[PDB]
């Protein structure tokens, strides 16, 4: 229910949301400035007398026309190789981002990643890729726990003259007694001998308490 | 449908010019889209509107399987009609 409510919620935001994608729009604006400046160079003197050699040719002589063209052509030979330098520093930023996106899909789409915030912020679930005209976006699915609620813990408990430690779990008390839930939900069952392990006594720990550990082993008797 | 050097009532340029349906202001003669590239002009004789179009062009790339497979080769006219050969 919450999975598809969240999909509908991305629906309604993305049909309404502005400035979400703005970055690919920047990149097209950004190439577009590049070439528009390149054009507005080709109609530019670069320190020449005119921006057009054709009028030169139709009114001037070979030597002066060709020196003016020499300075004209030097100007355009920068403007081009400058543009090429511009583009391949764009393309370097792209190639970095592309390795990063390939890794992103490898780890979030093609696998389950423990990396923190590498597949979006929150406890990782999942990611759905979703292409763009010049890009692709991953719809990252991630888990958020809720309703925290405060109890007191104990690393182990003094029993049989032993500190019986959680094999995989934690011991909490609500106010008076002592349930075994897991670390990152309230998923309780009852603290028992079969769901916690002993290693040594309880005469060194700080924070241990006296109490019993249930053991379903006498009732085998009857 | 010809890339040609044109001089219309003293206005000279080179390229392929065709008809345009555009309407210039009665005083307005010739048109450049963004980038200052002429797109249409008002006729010197008739002051009708005629489209200025880019002198056709294209790339030239040659396509091979490598020599040692063959001396054979495919050829591409590049964003170009092969009517223009």
């Amino acid at each position: 229910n919450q999975f598809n409510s969240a999909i509908g919620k991305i629906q309604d935001s993305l049909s309404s949301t502005p400035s979400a994608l703005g970055k690919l729009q920047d990149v097209v604006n950004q190439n577009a400035q590049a070439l528009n400046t390149l054009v507005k160079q080709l109609s530019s003197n670069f320190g020449a007398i005119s921006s057009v050699l054709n009028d030169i040719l139709s009114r001037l002589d070979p030597p002066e026309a060709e020196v003016q063209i020499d300075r004209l052509i030097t100007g355009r030979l920068q403007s081009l190789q400058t543009y090429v330098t511009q583009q391949l520093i764009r393309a370097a930023e792209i190639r970095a981002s592309a390795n990063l996106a390939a890794t992103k899909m490898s780890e979030c789409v093609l696998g389950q990643s423990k990396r923190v915030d590498f597949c979006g912020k929150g406890y990782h679930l999942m990611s759905f890729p979703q292409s763009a005209p010049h890009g692709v976006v991953f719809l990252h699915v991630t888990y958020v726990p809720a309703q925290e609620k405060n109890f007191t813990t104990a690393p182990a408990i003094c029993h049989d003259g032993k500190a019986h430690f959680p094999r995989e779990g934690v011991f909490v008390s609500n106010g008076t007694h002592w349930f075994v839930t897991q670390r990152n939900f309230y998923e309780p069952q009852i603290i028992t001998t079969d769901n916690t392990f002993v290693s040594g006594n309880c005469d060194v720990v700080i924070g241990i308490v006296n109490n019993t550990v249930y053991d379903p082993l006498q009732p085998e008797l009857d | 449908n010809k890339c040609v050097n044109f001089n219309f009532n003293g206005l000279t340029g080179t390229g392929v010019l065709t008809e345009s349906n555009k309407k210039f202001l009665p005083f307005q003669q010739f048109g450049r889209d963004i980038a200052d590239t002429t797109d249409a002009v008002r006729d010197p004789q008739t002051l009708e509107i005629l489209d200025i179009t880019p002198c056709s062009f294209g790339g030239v790339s040659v396509i091979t399987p490598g020599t040692n497979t063959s001396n054979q080769v495919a050829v591409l006219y590049q964003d170009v009609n092969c009517t223009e050969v």
């Binding site: 097209v28 890729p129 979703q130 292409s131 005209p133 | 590239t37």
Partner: peptide, 23 residues
């Protein structure tokens, strides 16, 4: 979203990227 300068069309048309994404 000219002058003897042009831009090539993307190698992988959205139809490709679409059923690559679908697979």
């Amino acid at each position: 979203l000219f002058n003897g300068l042009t831009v090539l069309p993307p190698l992988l048309t959205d139809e490709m990227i679409a059923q690559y994404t679908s697979a």
